[PDB]
Scaffold this active site. Structure first.
Site, mmCIF file in Angstrom:
data_model
loop_
_atom_site.group_PDB
_atom_site.id
_atom_site.type_symbol
_atom_site.label_atom_id
_atom_site.label_comp_id
_atom_site.label_asym_id
_atom_site.label_seq_id
_atom_site.Cartn_x
_atom_site.Cartn_y
_atom_site.Cartn_z
ATOM 1 N N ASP A 35 0.836 -1.198 0.000
ATOM 2 C CA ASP A 35 0.000 0.000 0.000
ATOM 3 C C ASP A 35 0.872 1.250 0.000
ATOM 4 O O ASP A 35 1.352 1.669 1.060
ATOM 5 C CB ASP A 35 -0.909 -0.019 1.223
ATOM 6 N N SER A 199 -0.610 15.548 -12.067
ATOM 7 C CA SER A 199 -0.833 15.186 -13.454
ATOM 8 C C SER A 199 -1.073 16.445 -14.280
ATOM 9 O O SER A 199 -1.612 17.442 -13.794
ATOM 10 C CB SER A 199 -2.007 14.206 -13.545
#
Length: 330
Positions: A35, A199
């Site tokens: 994770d 992004s």
């Protein structure tokens, strides 16, 4: 040193991925959910409340000659999906894919919430976010990667998750045969303890690319792709009959649909998520309403590049003094 381990989807939907981890002496092999959105290595154990164990493999520290109680240390964690676990702490030897750390904090669960009990395939979590998020008190502990870093050939790990197939986590090296083209690296902020990056935009299907900054986290422990409501609405508007359902908890679409791809920007590069990766199947057995793999982050507080996005790429988690993320197509 290096390590290399195969990671395998837990079910036919890729709801999560499990990776075998050797703990203790003699080794006890548990299948952990790696994770990159958390920083605790915790396991089902001989200390876990018996009614909360249902098929998981447990770590028994009393059977490990290298286990030592970390006296006074406790841990307690709550995840974004509302699940939680807590317990005490041992140090022990932990190996992943041939890479060994001695003295790793292994957090032994005394209590786990129902979603953990109900998932017999996940024996615990191995956190790979920054150690500043580790929950051990009163002495915070380091992640497996943080402990291994100095010994690694290069201070990196990579995630290569498969679509409906096994993939690989590598530690200490970048497998140049595992991706196509080049790796595009992008800056990371560690201020929230995550692999947080920005992004450069998105496209829906064959549509034109929209240049827009989307701050979010690279999170292997989250199944889906959670993005701003504007982006998610633009995606699902291209699917006839798709709608957001408050009763189901997100966007659903007719199972008869063919989904468009979704592209996200990494600098000037582009990662394309095929439409099929966005299909999470019937909302309930036999339903013709299917659950979408791209969902709004509006209620989360952060955008999450979860498995739906990461499995479309070869992802480098670069733990150099200034961390960065790398993405390549594959």
């Amino acid at each position: 040193s290096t390590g290399s381990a195969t990671t395998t989807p837990i079910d036919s939907l890729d709801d999560a991925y499990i990776t075998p981890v050797q703990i203790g002496t003699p080794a006890q092999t548990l299948n952990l959910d790696f994770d990159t959105g958390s920083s605790d290595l915790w396991v089902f154990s001989s200390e876990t409340t018996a009614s909360e164990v249902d098929g998981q493999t447990i770590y028994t520290p009393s059977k490990s000659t290298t286990a030592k109680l970390l006296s006074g240390a406790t841990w307690s964690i709550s995840y974004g999906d509302g699940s939680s676990s807590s317990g005490d702490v041992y140090t022990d030897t932990v190996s992943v894919g041939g890479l060994t750390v001695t003295g790793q904090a292994v957090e032994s669960a005394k209590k786990v919430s129902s979603s953990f009990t109900e998932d017999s395939t996940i024996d615990g979590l191995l956190g790979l976010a920054f150690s500043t998020l580790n929950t051990v008190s009163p002495t915070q502990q380091k992640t497996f990667f943080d402990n291994a870093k100095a010994s690694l050939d290069s201070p990196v790990f990579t995630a290569d998750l498969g679509y409906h197939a096994p993939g690989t986590y590598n530690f200490g090296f970048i497998d140049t045969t595992a991706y196509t083209g080049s790796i595009t690296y992008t800056a990371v902020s560690t201020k929230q303890g995550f692999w947080e990056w920005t992004s450069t935009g998105y496209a829906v299907g064959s549509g034109t690319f929209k240049s827009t900054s989307i701050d979010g986290i690279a999170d292997t422990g989250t199944t889906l792709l959670y993005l701003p409501a504007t982006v998610v609405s633009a995606y699902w508007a291209q699917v006839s009959g798709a709608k957001s359902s408050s009763s189901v908890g997100g966007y659903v679409f007719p199972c008869s649909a063919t989904l468009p791809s979704f592209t996200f920007g990494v600098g000037s590069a582009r990662i394309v998520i095929p439409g099929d990766y966005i299909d999470f199947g019937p909302i309930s057995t036999g339903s013709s309403s299917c659950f979408g793999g791209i969902q709004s982050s509006a209620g989360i507080g952060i955008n999450i590049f979860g498995d739906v996005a990461l499995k479309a790429a070869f992802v480098v988690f670069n733990g150099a003094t200034t961390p960065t993320l790398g993405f390549a197509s594959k």
